[PDB]
């Protein structure tokens, strides 16, 4: 059953194994991290007890630092409240498409995706339906395993992501993931 060993050879270490794992992880973290209520026995975010490597830990702080700030924006937060909910499968695919509809197949929009889904994950957590939570994470790994996979693989894994968040005045980063995602919410429908 040994075959020949464990982990043969294949140019490009950061294969999909280390990626797919960091896919259901990172998210699974930022999720039960900011929404992880204290004294709440029986967490709806069942999957991984805790992150082993600290590689994700640090990357997790980035989602918490920006989340606390971005989540403090009455603008973006309001827009998400103006986008009625009647089909998370249609809109999700719609908005996710608008993100990089012509931009430049960059990748930054990705980060915004995690935040955009967060609302659907946490928002549905209150509706009293933990099923949607698991159904959501599915749309992520699916898109990431059907897309970012190729690109992310050429970016050196999720490392390229953290490597990008290493510039000066971050005020430019928040204006990017927002100016791109926000726009999607602007076109979708402008009602108030």
């Amino acid at each position: 059953m040994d075959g020949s060993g464990e982990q043969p050879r294949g140019g490009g270490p950061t294969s999909s194994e280390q990626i797919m794992k960091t896919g259901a992880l990172l998210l699974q973290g930022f999720i039960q991290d900011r929404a992880g209520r204290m004294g709440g026995e029986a967490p709806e975010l069942a999957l991984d007890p805790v992150p082993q490597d600290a590689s994700t830990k640090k990357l997790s702080e980035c989602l918490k630092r920006i989340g606390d700030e971005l989540d403090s924006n009455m603008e973006l937060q309001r827009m998400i409240a103006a986008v009625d909910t009647d089909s998370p499968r249609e809109v999700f695919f719609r908005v996710a498409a608008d993100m990089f509809s012509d931009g430049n197949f960059n990748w930054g929009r990705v980060v915004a995706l995690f935040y955009f889904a967060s609302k659907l994950v946490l928002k549905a957590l209150c509706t009293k339906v933990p099923e949607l939570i698991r159904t959501i994470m599915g749309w992520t790994l699916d898109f990431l395993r059907e897309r970012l996979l190729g690109w992310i693989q050429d970016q050196g894994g999720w490392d390229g992501l953290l490597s990008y968040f290493g510039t000066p005045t971050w005020q430019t980063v928040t204006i990017f993931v927002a100016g791109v995602l926000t726009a999607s919410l602007t076109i979708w429908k402008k009602m108030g």
């Binding site: 009455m74 409240a81 909910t85 509706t127």
Partner: peptide, 21 residues
């Protein structure tokens, strides 16, 4: 910062929709 003043009847109805799907 609190209370959305828009999630009471909007939701209660969002789910109801139809009795016994």
């Amino acid at each position: 910062c609190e209370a959305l003043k828009k999630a009471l009847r909007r939701h209660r109805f969002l789910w109801q929709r139809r009795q016994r799907a």
